[PDB]
Design a protein around this ligand. Sequence first.
Ligand SMILES: CCCCC/C=C\C/C=C\CCCCCCCC(=O)O
Lengths: 49, 48
Amino acid sequence: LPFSMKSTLAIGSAEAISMFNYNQDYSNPTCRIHAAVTANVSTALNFTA
Amino acid sequence: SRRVFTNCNYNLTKLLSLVQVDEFVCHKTTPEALATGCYSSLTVDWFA
Ligand SMILES: CCCCC/C=C\C/C=C\CCCCCCCC(=O)O
């Protein structure tokens, strides 16, 4: 998921992402991590998109 | 500019289809409540 739409994963959001795609559970401890795999690391591994 | 809305209904997902949200800061409410619950009046102050 790109960083331009990381507010859809924020709590209380009214976007369709939370109510149809990913609804995070907060009953147990959690960490939501927005990271970026760079192109050099992507070619070093087999990671594609 | 400022507008105050009373005695009306709003289709919110049509208004969210026109914009892309970068960040929202809410106090004592959530956008989910404004998507579900009712309230006495609505005030919008918008600028660029
Ligand atoms: C065009 C949006 C701003 C104008 C809204 C005007 C009236 C609607 C009133 C309350 C609904 C606000 C919910 C907005 C959700 C954005 C946060 C998000 O879930 O990402």
